Amino acid sequence: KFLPFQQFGRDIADTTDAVRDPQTLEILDITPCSFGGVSVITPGTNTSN
Amino acid sequence: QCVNLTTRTQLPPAYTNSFTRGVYYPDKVFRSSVLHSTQDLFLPFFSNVT
Numbered sequence: 818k819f820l821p822f823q824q825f826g827r828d829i830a831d832t833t834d835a836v837r838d839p840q841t842l843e844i845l846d847i848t849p850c851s852f853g854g855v856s857v858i859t860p861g862t863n864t865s866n
Numbered sequence: 867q868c869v870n871l872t873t874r875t876q877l878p879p880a881y882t883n884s885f886t887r888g889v890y891y892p893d894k895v896f897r898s899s900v901l902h903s904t905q906d907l908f909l910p911f912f913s914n915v916t
């Protein structure tokens with residue numbers, strides 16, 4: 818924590834290194850979830866399945 | 867019920883300048899190095915206060 822009347826950590830636009838407002842307050846890091854897309858590599862139906 | 871309180875010598879008013887006084891914290895939200903625009907009431911950057 819840094820100062821009492823303001824504790825919600827956030828640095829650029831969306832990181833928001835806090836949660837909302839706990840009684841113990843204080844801020845550690847951010848890891849809600851982070852995963853991306855998928856693609857399929859094929860050689861050709863008439864070549865293989 | 868009247869009280870007689872007269873002043874024989876009155877000190878003339880003076881002008882007091884101020885640079886960066888009068889900018890409060892309307893919201894309790896912390897801002898870890900972010901630039902935000904405010905729309906509230908503040909004292910001017912350069913002025914004379916009574």
Ligand SMILES: *[C@@H]1O[C@H](CO)[C@@H](O)[C@H](O)[C@H]1NC(C)=O
Pocket residue numbers: 840841
């Ligand atoms: C309960 O509140 C106190 C604050 O006095 C602090 O220990 C913490 O924020 C809360 N949780 C526990 C387990 O004490």
Ligand SMILES: *[C@@H]1O[C@H](CO)[C@@H](O)[C@H](O)[C@H]1NC(C)=O
Pocket residue numbers: 863864
């Ligand atoms: C697939 O390959 C075979 C032999 O190379 C060819 O005869 C055929 O026209 C190709 N295409 C399809 C849709 O089978």
